[PDB]
RNA sequence: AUCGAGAGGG
DNA sequence: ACGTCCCTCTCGA
């Protein structure tokens, strides 16, 4: 068919599951690894504040906004503020946002991710939207106000890779395993009387097989077939966060050649 | 959650700390230094508090 | 070789008793015929607190 | 207490012996008692040893 | 803050955790400073 | 305070050629590229792919320190056949392999649907 | 029923009461 | 510190992708060195963690109060049936390589605490500078910036 | 014992000390902010002048 | 700061973050650590003074201490704790990983050496790989109990022309000892030659470790096998060896030993029955722990940990000692308003039978406390006793 | 001091699921470790994020202005 | 250069000893029955419960066919005794006893032990 | 407590649990007593009521039922701070003496009026966290309601040797 | 600024 | 008669 072949296990809204057959560990690792922090996404970066009577400090809430997930589907259509041409930022490099909230409610009154609003040119690209996974659809509780507390701040939302800060974290947790029955002896165990009946079979041992004790160890046993499960907060769909995992890597290797043939 | 106890004197919350002491108006006796001309002694802390 | 001697003999002694709280009491830490036995020596003083002829 | 000494054959051996350990110190005349080893008796009082047997 | 409100400056063996001390001072809450177990924490 | 800037974990500084080749001073037919602003994502894999190359002898890499993002890769090959040429191939093998994942996931993805 | 003794967690409820009447800075108010 | 006279500053800082992980993809928040428990024998550091890894999966507050017939095995009894290793260990995978670690690693949520010592509050340098008036020598302390 | 047999000194430093497997025995990882304030008289000599004028 | 080895000179290496950073193996001579310790730094304002600090107060120059005429620095913690993991002949390296080790040695000769398995599984051994950091020109011979020219346990150490012949590295061969690899190399090869060796070994050793890994859990202090089943009787039979002398001493039959009182003979003969009780109760565990225990593997290298720490952790803490002798009767001829009067038991004169794993009772817990305090008094209070001696 | 956005350990959006956790344990009245488990948290890293949170913001608001 | 030994032995005793990766092995010969031989031999690759050689071919660097045997290796000789010879495989030691092969064997770091069956 | 033939009992347990729905209940009922350190001489107390009457921690015995009183819970000898150690009955006595005056050098929610109170210097934490490891004593020292640290997922092992 | 007292840090 | 070395804070005439 090709080379490093694959077969999904499951697929879903937030998670995806797959065995990478005929892939090299150094690869499945290095892929895993770039998936974490090296795929671009958007997230609030600067934030100026006009009025904040809340209990939480200004930069308190500051740090909190940077961590709200933004839509990033089409994102390569935005180019890194730092690498663009406009005295600071523009619409070519940044989505801008604004949040008015005032404690009119005599109860205790909430501000969410929903409550955000975009006050720049979208230029017709899927960007800047604060994902809502929420059941109630009401977003992420940012703050709380007693009838009379106000909040006026606005948020310049630029493109970043987690390598610089977690907030530009497209990923979340990434499940990783391989060779369930330790057939490659890649890890000495730890037991009091029996190793076996104390270390529990992982939930993957059924797609590989038991080892027929009687038989010996094979010293040509190589690493192949890897059990992974990736998950994205939502900033990016989960197919794109795996495939623009692959993509980024290619580009990474790529610019080797690129500056190779310069010298 | 504040539980009191403290004075507020020109602003800074100062505290008072238990100053212990061997009770007064009591009696005890303690053999004393080998080279003293005294073998034991009887002490009453005489002070009406 | 002077101020050198002093630290070679003094050093040990301070950490013969700056490190007895590692266990929980036991023995010859820093309050048993040791660091103080030295207290005697350098000062001389006659009132030795455990004299003893060992006679063959 | 064991004390090493040469077994005639030439080597050193393990022939012990007794010793009377004291809780006071007047060597000045526990030197001269008979049936000890005045040439060996030892007392911690490096200050008495100084007066009895010589600075050196 | 509590632990400051229940502190007993014992002016100046007396430093040791004593048998009488059961149920009044803390077994092992005192300072590793130049007045260890001198100030006792009720 | 003495914190360096995070953006230096990638964005190459003033006139700092990304790759940099020197010749292994005492091992014959050998090189030490100093990859800048990169990490084990790259390293481990360039190298490991090299460990397939027919006429290539040595292939392994260190991180002279975790404060910095540079890492040296040292490669030596058969008489004639070129080290540089070796990295070359090993890189394409990579992206060709990656390419097949790209589409092999999307094929599988473009199946089940929830 | 009032004729049954006292366990561990029984004494907790006691202590619980102890502070409700006296608190934690007793001696120092008092 | 943790709650066991278990101090130490920060040696270096690393990122999820570079740091070891468990199969379910959980990363250590912090990493202490085994070489600081034989010397002291802080076994409740050990169990606090082992209990609290139950506290976690269980949803129910973990009891550390002292004179309690709550056996160690008492805890690990549950620990096994929640899923993970009976004694808290877990097969760990080298962050840098993807390879596993021939040694499994003991892993749970021990409560820790920030203390009031920041390096940036402590650092200080001086080369010529403010000068006392009777002794003519340097001056005392980071405050007054001196020697 | 305070202002002669000991004094304080210009050109001195301080900070938390951490430890480094990727370092050599005989060197010490001093931070910038000390190196920016830690000076050092150096004379103008033809062997360095082409250096000092780039530091200035 | 009470000695030369604690005011050594260094080369600078300007770096980020606000913290002085120094090589793990110059810890000791300063007795410093990485949990809150500041450190000073000076800087000569001249040239001659630099020379004075370079050619006299250097770090490699003071590699061997005059005071104790032995090397005052050496391999420690992670390096030492796993350098013996590596110098096993159970310990094998495969093709890939080896080069990564080779490269790391900054003075490598770039020759891939003759592996120790060839074909039915090309494979290298730790003692093999290690030796490239050991300067081809070194001979060393150390024997201990059981060490033959065909050493079965991997005991002692023989390395000729700077390559491991047999034996395990550990505190003895590598550490700061007298007949020690550091003491060898610093002598015949030169202060600074040695130096690099610190590096060459720290670098290559650490690498191997983070790929074999090494931790430690309560699992490395539970031996509740029949072992704790038999450690429970020595805690019993040794109450008999003090239960005998109990009413026997209160029947006057107690032989007033030459000198000491009858009272004092009872203590000094029971504490010999309790100490040897505590001791020879955990040395029943020191063999239940397979060679694949970690804290075993941590004292078996001598990286951290002593025996006592095991029996206090797994078997039984032991008799807790105020002022030298057992506990006291600060009450009425007794120890605790929970205990008989005029009572000389062990179960309340301070013998904490339970272990750290198990968990003291409030009694046992209390007496532990009293004991360490004087301990804590020994360190903060009476630490100025020899600080005075020194001035 | 309010719920923090997602998880310290793997950084998964958990700011949201707070108010939804409350009614699960209250309105529906159920087990703690069943309320989190049924909000999609199987990693005890995230789980530790919710279960050990004190919402002192509430004491805050309760103040005069 | 050439084959510098060829005697044939088999299983006398087998031992790990808190080991499990390697086993040293005791054995005396059967085609020349007046010698003993003790060999630290890896058991992951070749176990036992059978010939042997020495050779030195079929300085200078090392490349990824003498492979007619099965288990192979390479050690060094470090001290020889007399009536016995001792080789080290970077940790794996090996001793054999005799008086004949004075002509073939010689004290070198040379050594490519072999086995089969 | 007080012993005859132990006064307080599951009657007097419930006797107050409606409360949050009396110490002077237990003293004037003659169920309890205030014994200074001098009157401690003339009395006998069993550590645990149940324990002393007729593979876990190998436990103390009872013996001569001459018992005047009984100890409420042993745990109350602890101090104001140390009360927060997770299982000090498994730790070396000098360590406990450190965690003790080390939780006094910490960071956390020191009051709740931190915002309108303004004093010289003061730290507050960003996301306080009730410890997953709790001792009964905490309840009374109002801890979980103003924690001091955060349940760090932690793993111990060697790595970078940093 | 200076002297005096106080809590912590290795 | 002196009574271990250094260091960081905070506060009253
Ligand atoms: N009172 C003191 N006087 C002199 N030096 C001290 C004193 N207290 C600590 N130090 C120095 O601090 C170092 C050890 O103290 P520290 O408490 O850090 O030891 P530690 O072993 O880390 O603590 P822990 O014992 O809990 O592990 C030594 O170099 C010692 O000289
Ligand atoms: Mn300390
Ligand atoms: Mn320390
Ligand atoms: Mn320290
Ligand atoms: Zn722009
Ligand atoms: Zn999480």
Name the residue of C12, C16, C18 whose CB sits within 8 Å of the most ligand 1 atoms, as the mutation to test its pocket: C18
- Strands (DSSP E) contained in B1-49 are 7-9, 12-14, 18-19, 27-29, 42-44
Give dist(CA J23, CA J21) in Å, integer.
Answer: 7
Residue A231's nearest CA partner among A32, A97, A49 is A32
Q: What is the CATH number of the domain that holds F88?
A: 3.30.1360.10
Place of tokens 């997602």: K6
| Among the listed residues F14, F72, F4, F15, the one whose alpha carbon sits nearest the alpha carbon of residue F38 | F72
**Helix or strand (DSSP H, E) at J81:** helix J77-86
* E29 within 8 A of E41, measured Cβ to Cβ: yes
DSSP string of H83-132, one letter each residue: SS-TTSEE--B-TTTS-B-SS-EEEE--EE---S--HHHH-EEESS----
Overall number of domains in chain A = 2
Q: At what angle do helices A25-37 and F83-109 cross, to 10 degrees?
A: 70
Cβ contact, residue pair F2, I31, below 8 Å: yes
Q: Quote the CA–CA distance of M150 and M127 in Å, as a whole number.
A: 8
d(CA M162, CA M159): 7
CATH topology for K1-65? Answer: Arc Repressor Mutant, subunit A (1.10.10)
Q: What range does the domain containing F36 cover? A: 1-114
Asked if A159 contacts A78 with a C-beta cutoff of 8 angstroms, the reply is yes
What architecture is the L1-117 domain classified under in CATH? Answer: Beta Barrel (2.40)
Smallest CA-to-CA distance from A259 within J68, F16, H71, K7 is with F16
Q: What determination technique applies here?
A: X-ray
Chains touching chain A at 3 or more Cβ pairs under 8 angstroms?
F, H, J, K, L, M
* Residue numbers of M between 21 and 60 with CB closer than 8 Å to G: 22-26, 48-50
What burial class does residue J161 get, using C-beta atoms within 10 Å of its C-beta: 0-12 exposed, 13-18 middle, 19+ buried?
A: middle
Task: Tell me the C-alpha distance between M157 and J209, whole Å.
Answer: 10
Residue H105 to residue M156, Cβ atoms within 8 A: yes
Which residues in chain D are contacts of C52 at CB distance < 8 A? 21-25, 43-44
Give the length of chain B. 49
Write down which chains contact chain I via at least 3 CB pairs under 8 A: F, H, J, M
- Beta-sheet pairing, D20-21 with B7-9: unpaired
Identify the sign of the CA torsion D1, D2, D8, D12.
negative
Say how many domains are in chain F. 1
CATH of the domain at A31: 3.30.1360.10
Q: Is J35 annotated as a binding residue?
A: yes
CA distance J386 to C31: 12
Phi-psi region of I49 (alpha: psi -120 to 50; beta: other; left: phi over 0): alpha
Alpha carbons M53 and H67: distance in angstroms, whole number: 18
How far apart, in whole angstroms, are the C-alpha atoms of residue M74 and residue M67?
16
Reference G28, options E26, B17, B11, M139; nearest CA is B17
Give the residue from A125, A144, A166 where a domain finishes.
A166
Which positions of chain O lie under 7 Å from any protein Cβ? 3-12
Give the residue numbers spanning the domain of A87.
Answer: 41-166
Residue among J48, J64, J45, J50 nearest J11 (CA): J50
Non-local (6+) Cβ contacts of H140 within 8 A are: H146, I8
CA distances from A15 to F114, K38, M48 (A): 11, 17, 53
Nominal resolution in Å? Answer: 3.0
**Residue showing tokens 């004299």:** C51
Cα–ligand 4 centroid distance for J33 (angstroms): 5
M69-70 and M45-46 beta bridge pairing = parallel
Dihedral, CA atoms, I38, I44, I46, I49, nearest 10 degrees? Answer: 50
User: Of A108, A133, A166, at which residue does a domain stop?
Assistant: A166
B20 - beta bridge partners?
A: none
d(CA J346, CA J333): 15
The minimum-distance atom of ligand 1 relative to the CA of E32 is 1
State which of A134, A166, A198 marks the end of a domain.
A166
H38: nearest CB among J295, J359, J365: J295
DSSP designation for L52: -
Contact A128, A134 (CB under 8 A): no
Write down the residue that tokens 């278990």 correspond to: H6
**Interchain contact, B5 vs E42, CB within 8 Å:** no
C-alpha atoms less than 13 angstroms from C-alpha of A29 in its C-beta half-sphere: 27
Nearest to G6 among M8, M19, M140 (CB): M8
Shared domain for A161 and A177, answered yes or no, is: no
Q: In terms of domains, do A27 and A102 share one?
A: no
Q: Are residues A33 and A124 in the same domain?
A: no
Token pair in block for residue A156? 């310049």
CA separation for the pair A117, J88 (Å, rounded): 64
User: Which ligand is nearest to the Cα of residue H8, counting in written order?
Assistant: 3
Strands J351-352, J124-125: parallel, antiparallel or unpaired by DSSP? unpaired
- Give the separation between CA M125 and CA M147, rounded to whole angstroms: 9
Q: Give the burial string for J137-159 (b: 16+ CB within 10 Å, else e).
A: ebebebeeeebebbbeebbbbbb
């Amino acid at each position: 068919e090709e080379g490093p072949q694959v077969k999904i296990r499951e697929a879903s809204k937030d998670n995806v599951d797959f065995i990478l057959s005929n892939v090299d560990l150094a690869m499945a690792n290095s892929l895993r690894r770039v998936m974490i922090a090296e795929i671009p996404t958007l997230a609030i970066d600067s934030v100026e504040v006009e009025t904040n009577t809340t209990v939480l400090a200004d930069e308190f809430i500051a740090h909190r906004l940077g961590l709200i997930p933004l839509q990033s589907m089409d994102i390569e259509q935005l180019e890194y503020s730092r690498d663009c041409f406009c005295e600071d930022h523009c619409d070519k490099c940044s989505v801008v946002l604004t949040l008015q909230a005032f404690g009119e409610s005599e109860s205790t009154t909430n501000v969410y991710s929903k409550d955000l609003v975009i006050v720049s040119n979208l230029m017709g690209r899927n960007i800047g939207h604060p994902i809502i996974q929420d059941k109630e659809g009401n977003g992420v509780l940012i703050c709380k106000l007693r009838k009379g507390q106000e909040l006026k701040l606005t948020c310049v939302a630029k493109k970043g890779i987690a390598k610089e800060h977690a907030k530009w974290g497209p990923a979340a947790a990434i499940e990783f395993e391989y060779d369930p029955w330790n057939k490659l002896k890649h890890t000495d165990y730890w037991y009091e009387q029996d190793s076996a009946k104390e270390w529990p079979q992982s939930k993957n041992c059924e797609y590989e097989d038991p080892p027929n004790e009687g038989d010996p160890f094979d010293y040509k046993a190589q690493a192949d077939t890897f059990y992974m499960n990736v998950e994205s907060v939502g900033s990016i769909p989960v197919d794109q966060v795996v495939v623009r995992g692959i993509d980024t890597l290619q580009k990474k290797v790529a610019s080797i050649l690129l500056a190779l043939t310069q010298m | 959650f504040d539980m009191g106890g403290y004075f507020i004197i020109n602003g800074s919350e100062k505290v008072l700390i238990a100053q212990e002491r061997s009770a007064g108006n009591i009696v005890q006796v303690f053999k004393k230094a080998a080279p003293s001309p005294i073998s034991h002694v009887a002490e009453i802390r005489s002070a009406l508090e | 070789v002077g101020v050198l001697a002093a630290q070679s003999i003094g050093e040990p002694a301070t950490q013969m008793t700056l490190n007895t709280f590692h266990f929980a009491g036991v023995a010859s830490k820093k309050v048993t015929s040791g660091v103080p036995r030295l207290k005697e020596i350098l000062n001389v003083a006659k009132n030795m607190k455990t004299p003893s002829l060992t006679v063959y | 207490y064991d004390r090493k000494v040469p077994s005639p054959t030439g080597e050193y051996v393990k022939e012990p012996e007794w010793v009377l350990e004291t809780d006071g110190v007047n060597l000045s005349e526990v030197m001269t008692v008979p049936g000890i080893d005045p040439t060996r008796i030892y007392t911690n009082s490096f200050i008495d040893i100084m007066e009895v047997l010589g600075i050196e | 803050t509590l632990s400051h409100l229940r502190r007993t400056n014992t002016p100046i063996k007396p430093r040791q955790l004593h048998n009488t001390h059961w149920g009044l001072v803390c077994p092992a809450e005192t300072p590793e400073g130049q007045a260890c177990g001198l100030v006792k924490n009720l | 305070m003495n914190a360096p800037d995070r953006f230096e974990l990638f964005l190459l500084g003033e006139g700092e050629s990304k790759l940099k080749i020197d010749p292994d001073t005492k091992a014959p037919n050998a090189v030490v590229i100093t990859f800048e602003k990169e990490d084990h994502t790259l390293g481990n894999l360039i190298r490991a792919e090299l460990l397939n190359d027919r006429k290539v002898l040595f292939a392994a890499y260190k991180v002279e320190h975790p404060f910095f993002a540079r890492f040296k890769l040292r490669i030596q090959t058969t008489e004639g056949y070129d080290p540089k040429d070796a990295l070359k191939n090993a890189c394409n093998s990579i992206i060709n392999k990656l390419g097949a994942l790209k589409t092999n996931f999307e094929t599988e993805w473009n199946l089940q649907t929830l | 029923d009032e004729s049954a003794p006292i366990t561990a967690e029984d004494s907790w409820a006691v202590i619980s009461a102890f502070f409700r009447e006296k608190g934690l800075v007793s001696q120092q108010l008092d | 510190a943790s709650r066991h006279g278990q101090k130490g500053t920060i040696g270096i800082t690393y990122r999820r992708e570079d740091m070891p992980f468990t199969a379910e993809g959980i990363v250590p928040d912090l990493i202490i060195n085994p070489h600081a428990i034989p010397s002291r024998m802080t076994v409740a550091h050990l169990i606090e963690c082992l209990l609290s890894k139950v506290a976690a999966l269980s949803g129910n507050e973990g009891d550390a109060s002292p004179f309690t017939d709550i056996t160690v095995e008492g805890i690990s009894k549950l620990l096994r049936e929640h899923g993970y290793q009976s004694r808290g260990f877990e097969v760990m995978y080298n962050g840098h390589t993807g390879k596993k670690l021939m040694a499994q690693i003991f892993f749970g949520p021990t409560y820790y605490q920030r203390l009031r010592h920041m390096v940036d509050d402590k650092i200080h340098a001086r080369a010529r500078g403010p000068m006392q008036v009777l002794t003519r020598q340097p001056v005392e302390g980071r405050s007054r910036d001196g020697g | 014992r305070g202002n002669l047999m000991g004094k304080r000194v210009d050109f001195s430093a301080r900070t938390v000390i951490s430890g480094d497997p990727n370092l050599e025995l005989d060197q010490v990882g001093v931070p910038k902010s000390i190196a920016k304030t830690l000076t050092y008289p150096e004379v103008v000599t033809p062997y360095n002048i082409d250096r000092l004028t780039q530091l200035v | 700061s009470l000695h030369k080895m604690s005011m050594m000179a260094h080369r600078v290496k300007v770096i980020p973050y606000s913290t002085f950073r120094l090589n793990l193996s110059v810890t000791s001579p300063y007795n410093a650590d990485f949990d809150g310790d500041e450190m000073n730094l000076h800087v000569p304002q001249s040239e001659e003074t630099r020379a004075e600090l370079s050619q006299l107060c250097a770090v490699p120059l003071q590699i061997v201490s005059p005071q104790s005429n032995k090397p005052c620095m050496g391999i420690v913690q992670d390096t030492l704790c796993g350098i013996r993991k590596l110098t096993l002949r159970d310990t094998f390296i495969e093709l890939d990983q080896v080069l990564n080790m080779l490269y790391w040695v900054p003075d490598w000769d770039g020759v891939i050496p003759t592996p120790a398995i060839i074909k039915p599984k090309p494979l290298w051994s730790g003692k093999q790989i290690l030796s490239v950091a050991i300067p081809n020109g070194i001979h060393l011979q150390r024997f201990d109990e059981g060490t033959t020219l065909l050493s079965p346990k991997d005991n002692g150490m023989l390395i000729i022309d700077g390559q491991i012949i047999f034996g395990v590295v550990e505190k003895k061969t590598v550490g700061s000892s007298n007949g020690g690899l550091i003491h060898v190399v610093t002598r015949e090869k030169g202060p600074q030659v040695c130096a690099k060796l610190f590096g060459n070994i720290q670098k290559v050793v650490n690498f191997w470790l983070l790929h074999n890994g090494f931790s430690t859990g309560i699992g490395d202090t539970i031996a509740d096998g029949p072992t704790m089943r038999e450690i429970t009787e020595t805690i019993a039979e040794a109450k008999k060896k003090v239960l005998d002398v109990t009413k026997e001493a209160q029947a006057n039959l107690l032989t007033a030993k030459h000198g000491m009182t009858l009272r004092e003979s009872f203590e000094d003969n029971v504490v010999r029955f309790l100490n040897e009780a505590r001791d020879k109760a955990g040395r029943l565990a020191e063999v239940n722990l397979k060679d694949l225990n970690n804290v075993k593997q941590m004292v078996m290298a001598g990286s951290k940990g002593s025996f006592i720490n095991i029996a206090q952790m797994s078997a039984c803490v032991g008799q807790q000692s105020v002022e030298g002798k057992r506990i006291a009767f600060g009450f009425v001829d007794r120890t605790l308003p929970h205990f008989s009067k005029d009572d000389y038991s062990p179960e309340s004169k301070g013998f904490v039978e339970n272990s750290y794993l198990r968990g003291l009772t409030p009694q046992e817990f209390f007496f532990h406390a009293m004991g360490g305090r004087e301990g804590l008094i020994d360190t903060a209070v009476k630490t100025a006793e020899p600080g005075y001696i020194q001035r | 001091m309010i719920v923090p956005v997602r998880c310290f350990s793997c950084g998964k959006v958990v700011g949201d699921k707070w108010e939804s956790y409350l009614n699960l344990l209250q309105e529906d009245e159920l087990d703690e470790g069943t309320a989190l488990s049924r909000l999609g948290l199987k990693r005890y890293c995230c789980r530790r994020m919710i279960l050990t949170h004190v919402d002192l913001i509430e004491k805050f608001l309760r103040y005069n202005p | 250069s050439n084959t510098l030994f060829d005697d044939i032995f088999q299983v006398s005793e087998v031992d790990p000893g808190r080991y499990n990766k390697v086993c040293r092995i005791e054995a005396a010969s059967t085609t020349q029955d007046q010698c003993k031989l003790t060999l630290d031999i890896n058991v992951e690759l070749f176990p036992v419960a059978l010939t042997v050689t020495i050779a030195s071919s079929l300085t200078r660097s090392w490349r990824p066919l003498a492979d007619d045997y099965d288990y192979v290796m390479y050690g060094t000789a470090y001290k020889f005794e007399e009536v016995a010879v001792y080789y080290s495989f970077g940790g794996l030691l090996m001793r054999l006893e005799g008086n004949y092969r004075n002509l073939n064997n010689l004290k070198q770091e040379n050594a490519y032990l072999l086995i089969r069956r | 407590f007080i012993v005859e033939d132990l006064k307080v009992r599951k009657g007097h347990i419930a006797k107050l649990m409606a409360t949050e729905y009396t110490w002077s209940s237990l003293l004037n009922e003659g169920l309890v007593e205030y014994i200074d350190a001098e009157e401690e001489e003339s009395i006998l107390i069993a550590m645990q009521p149940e324990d002393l009457e007729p593979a876990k921690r190998i436990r103390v015995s009872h013996h001569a039922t001459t018992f005047t009183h009984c100890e409420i819970h042993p745990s109350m000898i602890l101090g104001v701070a140390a009360s927060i150690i997770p299982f000090p009955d498994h730790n070396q006595s000098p360590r406990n003496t450190y965690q003790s005056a080390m939780g006094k050098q910490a960071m956390g929610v020191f009051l709740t009026n931190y915002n309108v109170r303004m004093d010289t210097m003061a730290n507050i934490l960003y996301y306080p966290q009730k410890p997953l490891g709790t001792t009964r004593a905490m309840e009374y020292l109002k801890f979980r309601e103003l924690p001091a640290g955060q349940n760090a997922i932690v793993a111990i092992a060697c790595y970078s040797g940093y």
